[PDB]
Coordinates of N, CA and C in Angstrom, one line a residue:
Chain A
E1 N 10.7 0.7 3.2 CA 10.6 -0.3 4.2 C 9.4 -1.2 3.9
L2 N 8.3 -0.9 4.6 CA 7.3 -2.0 5.0 C 7.9 -3.4 5.2
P3 N 7.8 -3.8 6.4 CA 8.2 -5.1 6.9 C 7.4 -6.2 6.2
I4 N 8.0 -7.3 5.7 CA 7.4 -8.2 4.8 C 6.5 -9.2 5.6
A5 N 6.6 -9.4 6.9 CA 5.7 -10.4 7.6 C 4.3 -9.9 7.6
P6 N 4.0 -8.7 7.9 CA 2.6 -8.2 7.8 C 2.1 -8.2 6.4
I7 N 2.9 -8.0 5.4 CA 2.5 -8.1 4.0 C 2.0 -9.5 3.7
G8 N 2.8 -10.5 4.1 CA 2.4 -11.9 3.9 C 1.0 -12.1 4.5
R9 N 0.7 -11.6 5.7 CA -0.6 -11.8 6.3 C -1.7 -11.1 5.5
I10 N -1.4 -10.0 4.9 CA -2.5 -9.4 4.0 C -2.8 -10.4 2.9
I11 N -1.8 -11.0 2.3 CA -2.1 -12.0 1.2 C -2.9 -13.1 1.7
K12 N -2.6 -13.6 2.9 CA -3.4 -14.7 3.5 C -4.8 -14.3 3.8
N13 N -4.9 -13.0 4.2 CA -6.3 -12.5 4.5 C -7.2 -12.4 3.3
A14 N -6.6 -12.3 2.1 CA -7.3 -12.4 0.8 C -7.7 -13.8 0.4
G15 N -7.2 -14.8 1.1 CA -7.6 -16.1 0.7 C -6.5 -17.0 0.2
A16 N -5.2 -16.5 0.1 CA -4.2 -17.3 -0.5 C -3.8 -18.6 0.4
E17 N -3.7 -19.7 -0.3 CA -3.5 -20.9 0.4 C -2.0 -21.0 0.8
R18 N -1.1 -20.6 -0.2 CA 0.3 -20.6 0.0 C 0.9 -19.3 -0.6
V19 N 1.9 -18.8 0.1 CA 2.5 -17.5 -0.3 C 4.0 -17.7 -0.4
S20 N 4.5 -17.4 -1.6 CA 6.0 -17.5 -1.8 C 6.7 -16.3 -1.2
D21 N 7.9 -16.4 -0.8 CA 8.6 -15.2 -0.3 C 8.7 -14.1 -1.3
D22 N 8.9 -14.5 -2.6 CA 9.0 -13.4 -3.5 C 7.6 -12.7 -3.7
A23 N 6.5 -13.3 -3.5 CA 5.2 -12.5 -3.5 C 5.2 -11.5 -2.4
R24 N 5.6 -11.9 -1.2 CA 5.7 -10.9 -0.1 C 6.6 -9.7 -0.4
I25 N 7.7 -10.0 -0.9 CA 8.7 -8.9 -1.3 C 8.1 -8.0 -2.3
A26 N 7.5 -8.6 -3.4 CA 6.9 -7.8 -4.4 C 5.8 -6.9 -3.9
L27 N 4.9 -7.5 -3.1 CA 3.7 -6.7 -2.7 C 4.2 -5.6 -1.7
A28 N 5.2 -5.9 -0.9 CA 5.8 -4.8 0.0 C 6.3 -3.6 -0.9
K29 N 7.0 -4.0 -2.0 CA 7.6 -2.9 -2.9 C 6.5 -2.1 -3.5
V30 N 5.4 -2.8 -4.0 CA 4.3 -2.1 -4.7 C 3.6 -1.2 -3.7
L31 N 3.4 -1.7 -2.5 CA 2.7 -0.8 -1.5 C 3.6 0.4 -1.1
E32 N 4.9 0.1 -0.9 CA 5.8 1.3 -0.6 C 5.7 2.4 -1.7
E33 N 5.8 1.9 -3.0 CA 5.8 2.8 -4.1 C 4.5 3.6 -4.1
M34 N 3.4 2.9 -3.9 CA 2.1 3.6 -3.9 C 2.0 4.6 -2.7
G35 N 2.5 4.1 -1.6 CA 2.5 5.0 -0.4 C 3.3 6.3 -0.7
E36 N 4.4 6.2 -1.3 CA 5.3 7.3 -1.6 C 4.6 8.3 -2.5
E37 N 3.9 7.7 -3.5 CA 3.2 8.5 -4.5 C 2.0 9.3 -3.9
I38 N 1.2 8.5 -3.2 CA 0.1 9.2 -2.5 C 0.6 10.2 -1.5
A39 N 1.6 10.0 -0.7 CA 2.2 10.9 0.2 C 2.7 12.2 -0.5
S40 N 3.4 12.0 -1.6 CA 3.9 13.1 -2.4 C 2.8 14.1 -2.8
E41 N 1.7 13.5 -3.3 CA 0.6 14.2 -3.8 C -0.1 15.0 -2.7
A42 N -0.2 14.3 -1.5 CA -0.8 14.9 -0.3 C 0.0 16.1 0.2
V43 N 1.3 16.0 0.3 CA 2.1 17.2 0.7 C 1.8 18.3 -0.3
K44 N 1.7 18.0 -1.6 CA 1.5 19.1 -2.6 C 0.1 19.7 -2.4
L45 N -0.9 18.9 -2.2 CA -2.3 19.4 -2.1 C -2.3 20.4 -0.9
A46 N -1.6 19.9 0.1 CA -1.6 20.7 1.3 C -0.9 22.1 1.0
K47 N 0.2 22.0 0.4 CA 0.9 23.3 0.0 C 0.1 24.2 -0.9
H48 N -0.6 23.6 -1.9 CA -1.5 24.3 -2.8 C -2.6 25.0 -2.0
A49 N -2.9 24.3 -0.9 CA -4.0 24.9 -0.1 C -3.5 25.9 0.9
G50 N -2.2 25.9 1.0 CA -1.5 26.9 1.9 C -1.3 26.3 3.3
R51 N -1.0 25.0 3.4 CA -1.0 24.3 4.7 C 0.3 23.6 5.0
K52 N 0.7 23.5 6.3 CA 1.9 22.8 6.7 C 1.6 21.4 7.2
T53 N 0.5 21.2 7.8 CA 0.2 19.8 8.4 C -0.6 19.0 7.4
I54 N -0.2 17.8 7.2 CA -0.9 16.9 6.3 C -2.1 16.3 7.0
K55 N -3.3 16.5 6.5 CA -4.5 15.9 7.1 C -5.1 14.7 6.4
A56 N -6.1 14.0 7.0 CA -6.7 12.9 6.3 C -7.3 13.2 5.0
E57 N -7.8 14.4 4.9 CA -8.5 14.8 3.6 C -7.5 14.8 2.5
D58 N -6.3 15.2 2.9 CA -5.2 15.2 1.9 C -4.9 13.8 1.3
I59 N -4.9 12.9 2.2 CA -4.6 11.5 1.8 C -5.8 11.0 1.0
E60 N -7.0 11.3 1.5 CA -8.2 10.8 0.7 C -8.3 11.4 -0.7
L61 N -7.9 12.7 -0.9 CA -7.9 13.2 -2.2 C -6.8 12.7 -3.1
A62 N -5.6 12.6 -2.4 CA -4.5 12.0 -3.2 C -4.8 10.6 -3.7
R63 N -5.4 9.8 -2.8 CA -5.7 8.4 -3.2 C -6.6 8.4 -4.5
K64 N -7.4 9.4 -4.8 CA -8.2 9.2 -6.0 C -7.3 9.4 -7.3
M65 N -6.0 9.4 -7.2 CA -5.1 9.3 -8.4 C -4.8 7.9 -8.7
Chain B
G1 N -5.2 -2.8 11.5 CA -5.1 -3.9 10.6 C -3.7 -4.6 10.7
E2 N -3.3 -5.2 9.6 CA -2.0 -5.8 9.7 C -0.8 -4.9 9.6
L3 N -0.9 -3.8 8.9 CA 0.3 -2.9 8.8 C 0.5 -2.1 10.1
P4 N 1.8 -2.1 10.5 CA 2.1 -1.2 11.6 C 2.1 0.3 11.2
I5 N 1.7 1.2 12.1 CA 1.5 2.6 11.7 C 2.9 3.3 11.7
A6 N 3.9 2.9 12.4 CA 5.1 3.7 12.4 C 5.8 3.8 11.1
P7 N 6.0 2.7 10.4 CA 6.6 2.9 9.0 C 5.7 3.7 8.1
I8 N 4.4 3.8 8.3 CA 3.6 4.6 7.3 C 3.7 6.1 7.6
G9 N 3.8 6.5 8.9 CA 4.1 7.9 9.1 C 5.4 8.3 8.6
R10 N 6.4 7.4 8.6 CA 7.7 7.8 8.1 C 7.7 8.0 6.5
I11 N 6.8 7.2 5.8 CA 6.6 7.5 4.4 C 6.1 8.9 4.2
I12 N 5.2 9.4 5.0 CA 4.7 10.7 4.8 C 5.8 11.8 5.1
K13 N 6.5 11.6 6.2 CA 7.6 12.6 6.5 C 8.6 12.6 5.4
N14 N 9.0 11.4 4.9 CA 10.1 11.4 4.0 C 9.7 11.9 2.6
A15 N 8.4 12.1 2.4 CA 7.8 12.7 1.2 C 7.9 14.2 1.2
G16 N 8.3 14.8 2.4 CA 8.4 16.3 2.5 C 7.5 16.8 3.5
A17 N 6.6 16.1 4.2 CA 5.7 16.7 5.2 C 6.5 17.2 6.4
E18 N 6.2 18.5 6.6 CA 6.6 19.3 7.8 C 6.1 18.7 9.1
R19 N 4.8 18.4 9.1 CA 3.9 17.9 10.2 C 2.9 16.9 9.6
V20 N 2.6 15.9 10.4 CA 1.6 14.9 9.9 C 0.5 14.6 11.0
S21 N -0.8 14.8 10.7 CA -1.7 14.5 11.7 C -1.8 13.0 12.0
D22 N -2.3 12.6 13.2 CA -2.4 11.2 13.4 C -3.5 10.5 12.5
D23 N -4.6 11.2 12.3 CA -5.6 10.8 11.4 C -5.0 10.5 10.0
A24 N -4.0 11.3 9.5 CA -3.4 11.1 8.2 C -2.6 9.8 8.2
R25 N -1.8 9.5 9.2 CA -1.1 8.3 9.3 C -2.1 7.1 9.2
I26 N -3.1 7.1 10.0 CA -4.1 6.0 10.0 C -4.8 5.9 8.7
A27 N -5.1 7.1 8.1 CA -5.8 7.0 6.7 C -4.9 6.3 5.7
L28 N -3.6 6.7 5.7 CA -2.7 6.1 4.7 C -2.5 4.6 5.0
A29 N -2.4 4.2 6.2 CA -2.3 2.8 6.5 C -3.5 2.0 6.0
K30 N -4.7 2.6 6.2 CA -6.0 1.9 5.8 C -6.1 1.8 4.3
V31 N -5.7 2.9 3.6 CA -5.7 2.9 2.1 C -4.8 1.8 1.6
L32 N -3.6 1.8 2.1 CA -2.6 0.8 1.6 C -3.0 -0.6 1.9
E33 N -3.6 -0.9 3.1 CA -4.0 -2.3 3.4 C -5.1 -2.7 2.5
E34 N -6.1 -1.8 2.2 CA -7.2 -2.1 1.3 C -6.6 -2.4 -0.1
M35 N -5.7 -1.5 -0.6 CA -5.2 -1.7 -1.9 C -4.4 -3.1 -2.0
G36 N -3.7 -3.4 -0.9 CA -3.0 -4.6 -0.8 C -3.9 -5.8 -0.8
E37 N -5.0 -5.8 -0.1 CA -6.0 -6.9 -0.1 C -6.6 -7.0 -1.5
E38 N -6.9 -5.9 -2.2 CA -7.5 -6.1 -3.5 C -6.5 -6.7 -4.5
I39 N -5.3 -6.2 -4.5 CA -4.3 -6.8 -5.3 C -4.1 -8.3 -5.0
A40 N -4.0 -8.6 -3.7 CA -3.8 -10.0 -3.4 C -5.0 -10.9 -3.8
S41 N -6.2 -10.3 -3.7 CA -7.4 -11.1 -4.1 C -7.4 -11.5 -5.5
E42 N -6.9 -10.5 -6.3 CA -6.8 -10.7 -7.8 C -5.7 -11.7 -8.1
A43 N -4.5 -11.5 -7.3 CA -3.4 -12.4 -7.5 C -3.8 -13.9 -7.2
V44 N -4.7 -14.1 -6.2 CA -5.1 -15.5 -6.0 C -5.9 -16.1 -7.1
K45 N -6.7 -15.3 -7.8 CA -7.5 -15.7 -9.0 C -6.5 -16.0 -10.1
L46 N -5.5 -15.2 -10.3 CA -4.5 -15.4 -11.4 C -3.8 -16.7 -11.2
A47 N -3.4 -16.9 -10.0 CA -2.6 -18.2 -9.7 C -3.5 -19.4 -9.9
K48 N -4.8 -19.3 -9.4 CA -5.6 -20.5 -9.6 C -5.8 -20.8 -11.0
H49 N -5.9 -19.8 -11.9 CA -6.2 -20.2 -13.3 C -4.9 -20.6 -14.0
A50 N -3.7 -20.3 -13.4 CA -2.4 -20.8 -13.9 C -2.2 -22.3 -13.4
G51 N -3.2 -22.7 -12.6 CA -3.1 -24.0 -12.0 C -2.2 -24.1 -10.8
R52 N -2.0 -23.0 -10.0 CA -1.2 -23.0 -8.8 C -1.8 -22.7 -7.5
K53 N -1.4 -23.2 -6.4 CA -2.0 -22.7 -5.1 C -1.0 -21.7 -4.6
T54 N 0.2 -21.7 -5.0 CA 1.2 -20.7 -4.5 C 1.2 -19.4 -5.2
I55 N 1.0 -18.3 -4.5 CA 1.1 -17.0 -5.0 C 2.6 -16.6 -5.3
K56 N 2.8 -16.2 -6.5 CA 4.2 -15.8 -6.9 C 4.3 -14.2 -7.1
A57 N 5.5 -13.8 -7.2 CA 5.7 -12.3 -7.5 C 5.0 -12.0 -8.8
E58 N 5.1 -12.9 -9.8 CA 4.5 -12.5 -11.1 C 3.0 -12.3 -11.0
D59 N 2.3 -12.9 -10.1 CA 0.8 -12.8 -9.9 C 0.6 -11.4 -9.3
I60 N 1.4 -11.0 -8.3 CA 1.3 -9.6 -7.7 C 1.6 -8.6 -8.7
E61 N 2.6 -8.7 -9.6 CA 3.0 -7.7 -10.6 C 2.0 -7.6 -11.7
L62 N 1.3 -8.7 -12.0 CA 0.2 -8.5 -12.9 C -1.0 -7.8 -12.3
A63 N -1.4 -8.3 -11.1 CA -2.6 -7.8 -10.5 C -2.5 -6.3 -10.1
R64 N -1.3 -5.8 -9.8 CA -1.1 -4.4 -9.5 C -1.6 -3.5 -10.6
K65 N -1.7 -4.0 -11.9 CA -2.1 -3.2 -13.0 C -3.5 -2.7 -12.8
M66 N -4.3 -3.3 -11.9 CA -5.7 -2.8 -11.7 C -5.6 -1.4 -11.2
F67 N -4.5 -1.0 -10.5 CA -4.4 0.4 -10.0 C -3.5 1.3 -10.9
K68 N -3.3 0.9 -12.2 CA -2.5 1.9 -13.0 C -3.5 2.8 -13.7

């Protein structure tokens, strides 16, 4: 998912003067893919640690990939 | 920030999480927004040097390589 209107606002917040629709669609896809990969790693960290609930520390460690 | 939290908690559940803390949802939204801003900042520089003010998909797809 990720809805594309908030993604276009992220690009504006970085200073973009004009934003094409395809740039919004592309950045939504990139952030979904990264989100999925970080989440996947975080579920495994948790399981390797012996845990069912995903915590912030799981996300923070997974992000360093 | 700009990202809504509901879709981000669904990303974690759909990755296999049994349970997700609220702090974890917020952490993941903050990480993705920051990564998004850094990619977009670089995309803006790529477009300016191509002589454009409009950000294109190709600018995002090149800038994302900063995180490979």
